[PDB]
């Protein structure tokens, strides 16, 4: 071996392989933005658990009602509807939360 | 359906453009001592590409001389 060799690569079937670094997005942060095609104030997050990536977005529109988008759920169910699915049905609970 | 569409389909891939037989490719270098309508050709390429010719009464001598040189001397 050459002493100048720094190392850090694999040997697969007699060939030398190196793994590059992917510049992904933050794994759990919340990012807000705004598009001009509507007045939507979209805030989207990526959620990671055991290698599974899920995209969740909550936003408003011209109606002024908050809507939520969930994977495998095509329709944007309203915000209060999805909040009451998790409990805390009383109207005080939502505002307190 | 995929064989007929795209940049590698049967229309834009083979019918409109196709690979040709007599061609060559190499790097270029400047040469200001030749006239504008001439080009320099390496002797390696000139001995590979061929131009068919029909023997007549005004070029029989040159053709017969060329044939004798075989495929390894330059004029041949």
């Amino acid at each position: 071996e050459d002493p100048k060799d720094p190392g850090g690569y694999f040997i697969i079937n007699g060939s030398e392989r190196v793994i590059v670094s992917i510049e992904d997005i933050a794994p759990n942060r919340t990012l807000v933005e705004k598009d001009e095609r509507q007045e939507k104030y979209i805030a989207k997050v990526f959620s990671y658990r055991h290698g599974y990536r899920a995209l969740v977005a909550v936003e408003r529109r011209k109606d002024g009602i908050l809507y939520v988008d969930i994977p495998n759920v095509p329709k944007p169910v309203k915000f209060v509807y999805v909040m009451r699915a998790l409990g805390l049905e009383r109207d005080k609970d939502i505002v307190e939360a | 359906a995929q064989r007929l569409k795209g940049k590698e389909g049967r229309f834009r891939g083979n019918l409109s453009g196709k690979r040709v037989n007599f061609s060559a490719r190499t790097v270029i270098s400047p040469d200001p001592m030749i006239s504008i309508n001439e080009v320099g050709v390496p002797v390696e390429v000139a001995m590979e590409l061929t131009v068919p010719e029909k023997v007549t009464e005004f070029n029989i001598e040159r053709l017969r001389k060329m044939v004798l040189n075989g495929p390894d001397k330059y004029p041949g």
Binding site: - | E53, K54, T56, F58, N59, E61, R62
Partner: protein, 54 residues
């Protein structure tokens, strides 16, 4: 009076004719390729081919 397309077509036709057995109408130095013979014939003004124009 010939358009350059007509001139090129006539020269090509005569050059093809010469290389198949047609006799040359003018004396030519030996070793000349048939295309050059056709060109010489054209500039000497002895080409017999004519073009029909609508």
């Amino acid at each position: 009076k010939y358009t350059r397309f007509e001139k090129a077509r006539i020269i090509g036709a005569r050059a093809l004719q010469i290389s198949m057995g047609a006799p040359v109408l003018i004396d030519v130095p030996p070793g000349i390729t048939p295309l050059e013979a056709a060109i010489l014939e054209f500039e000497k003004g002895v080409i017999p081919i004519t073009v029909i124009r609508p």
